[PDB]
Design a protein around this ligand. Structure first.
Ligand SMILES: [Zn+2]
Ligand SMILES: [Zn+2]
Ligand SMILES: [Zn+2]
Ligand SMILES: [Zn+2]
Length: 166
């Protein structure tokens, strides 16, 4: 006899169905609590936390480590790429030379003195007489960084040949 869907309570007569969180589901019934996406089609896993079943992006958004821009002071979502320097994070558009206002990009040479950024061609000689050191702009990284998989629950797609992997 058919399995019951944990999402709707109904028997699952569909040819293809999902297994996740120890339960069977109609694919349409396994949805992100926040954005309603159909988890089994958009990706390979779900996240469980605080009564919710979430897609990866909303899990990051609601529970990942957000930060704040050292230049403008405003929060940075976990999902946003940031520039890094001397232990600070910056909005990409905030990562600019304090003298000429050029936006600094990966591979650029730059100087840092007491929070102020300077491009290679605006070396602040007057200030320098630790800022003498030339640094290389790194690639942008995600604000949230790496996170553990302890709330991740893989989704398995199954075929009922009326149960086999898909
Ligand atoms: Zn259902
Ligand atoms: Zn979502
Ligand atoms: Zn900023
Ligand atoms: Zn400059």
């Amino acid at each position: 006899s058919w399995k019951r869907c944990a999402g709707c309570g109904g028997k699952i007569a569909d040819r293809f169905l999902l297994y996740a969180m120890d339960s069977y589901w109609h694919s349409r019934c396994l949805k992100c609590s926040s954005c309603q996406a159909q988890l089994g089609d958009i990706g390979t896993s779900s996240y469980t936390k605080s009564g919710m079943i979430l897609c990866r992006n909303d899990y990051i958004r609601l529970f990942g480590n957000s930060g704040a821009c050292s230049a403008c002071g405003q929060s940075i979502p976990a999902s946003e790429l940031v520039m890094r320097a001397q232990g600070n994070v910056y909005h990409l558009k905030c990562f600019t030379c304090s003298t000429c206002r050029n936006r600094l990009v990966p591979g650029d040479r730059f100087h840092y003195i007491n929070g102020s950024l300077f491009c290679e061609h605006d070396r602040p000689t007057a200030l320098i007489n630790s800022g003498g050191d030339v640094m290389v702009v790194g690639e942008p990284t995600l604000m949230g960084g790496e996170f553990g998989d302890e709330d991740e629950r893989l989704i398995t797609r199954l075929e009922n040949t009326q149960i086999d992997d898909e």
